[PDB]
């Protein structure tokens, strides 16, 4: 009816949005019930990066974490993956969109990071960009630990070690189940005949720099065995040195 | 002073749609299309600067970037500075020049004085 043509009009507005105030019908989108229909009327695939930054701003600011999760999984993350794949870098507006999406961390981890990791096709540039984005944002310890348990339990991809390492650089107090999952993942790399890159070695090195004081002696010797079986000419002496000069408790 | 045989007083007191017969085709087309919000905001600014002036003193200068303004008879007496891309040019609004645009009163380029030619 009359609502449909107004939302076609604001669809035409959002396809060319650069700056300024948006219509007030756009800002009351989360307060409505049938949001998916009017959102598909607004055609988010044809949005401008500034318009999607404002949409992420609005949707993150208005509570209801499940709906923010659905918006991040359905609209924001495909746009990010399409922009990295074609432009080989992330836009300024979309970068601040992902930061304002990390304003809501619970919908972010379960909507942006974990679906990207379980998609399997996550490239290295996407890993670097998203890891820098989680590096900039201060993250709650519970959400970071749950995401680290998630990424530890998953099947390995080369992009996963960057996320794991940049989560270990946060230097938070770690739950001991999380460290058990990390050690079990690395000891799951014990019998792999695949050549592992320097990224995996750097993730292990980071785990030994920051959490060597909270490692049991049995898993310490297991990590020494791990270094023995899967060596590197450069990093493995340093990981061995850091494991040798560690005090527990 | 008179404009198409019409003097300034009955230019001011005349309503809007009889001015849609006394301009050129361009100005009639523009004012029939309707003026933008920025035109109307500058119009309020100019009338505010005109009302808030001493009777013997000229009004305060209103500076604007607008170059597509059509001078209506309401702005005769306004003290207006127009941007030409680099610098403001301040002008009195005279009544013999109502049928013109503001932007032609601030020229956006310099007259060319040719120097001695180089190697070519």
């Amino acid at each position: 009816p009359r609502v449909l043509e107004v939302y076609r009009g604001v669809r035409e507005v959002l396809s060319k949005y650069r700056s300024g105030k948006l219509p007030k019908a756009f800002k009351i989108i989360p307060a409505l019930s049938n949001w998916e229909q009017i959102l598909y009327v607004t055609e988010p695939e044809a949005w401008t990066a500034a318009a999607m930054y404002q949409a992420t701003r609005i949707f993150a600011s208005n509570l209801k974490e499940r709906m923010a999760q659905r918006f991040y999984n359905l609209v924001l993350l495909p746009r990010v993956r399409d922009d990295v794949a074609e432009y080989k870098r992330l836009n300024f507006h979309l970068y601040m969109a992902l930061k304002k999406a990390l304003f809501k961390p619970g919908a972010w981890f379960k909507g942006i990071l974990i679906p990207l990791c379980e998609s399997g096709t996550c490239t290295l540039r996407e890993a670097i960009i998203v890891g820098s984005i989680i590096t900039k944002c201060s993250i709650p310890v519970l959400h970071s630990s749950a995401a680290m348990l998630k990424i530890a339990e998953m099947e390995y991809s080369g992009a996963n070690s960057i996320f794991l390492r940049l989560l270990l650089d946060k230097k938070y107090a770690l739950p001991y189940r999380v460290l058990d999952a990390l050690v079990f993942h690395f000891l799951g790399f014990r019998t792999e005949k695949r050549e592992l890159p320097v990224l995996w070695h750097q993730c292990l090195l980071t785990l030994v720099q920051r959490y060597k004081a909270d490692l049991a002696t049995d898993q310490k010797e297991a990590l020494l065995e791990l270094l023995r079986l899967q060596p590197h000419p450069q990093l493995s002496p340093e990981i061995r040195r850091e494991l040798q000069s560690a005090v527990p408790r | 002073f008179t404009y198409r045989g019409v003097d300034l007083d009955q230019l001011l007191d005349m309503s809007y749609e009889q001015l849609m017969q006394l301009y050129s085709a361009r100005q009639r087309r523009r004012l029939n299309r309707g003026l933008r919000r920025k035109q109307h905001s500058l119009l309020k600014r100019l009338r505010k600067a005109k009302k808030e002036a001493p009777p013997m003193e000229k009004p305060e200068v209103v500076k604007t970037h607008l170059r597509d303004m059509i001078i209506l008879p309401e702005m005769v007496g306004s003290m207006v500075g127009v941007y030409n891309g680099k610098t403001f040019n301040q002008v009195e609004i005279k009544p013999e020049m109502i049928g013109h645009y503001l932007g032609e009163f601030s020229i956006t380029y310099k007259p060319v004085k040719h120097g001695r030619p180089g190697i070519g």
Partner: peptide
């Protein structure tokens, strides 16, 4: 919570949008 997870105002805003779209070109007031 992570692994186990998986109108009068409307018409008033419509009227405000229509008024805002009408106020872009006023063409009437002197």
């Amino acid at each position: 919570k992570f692994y186990e997870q998986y109108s009068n105002r409307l018409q008033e805003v419509l009227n405000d949008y229509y008024k805002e779209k009408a106020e872009n070109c006023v063409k009437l007031n002197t």
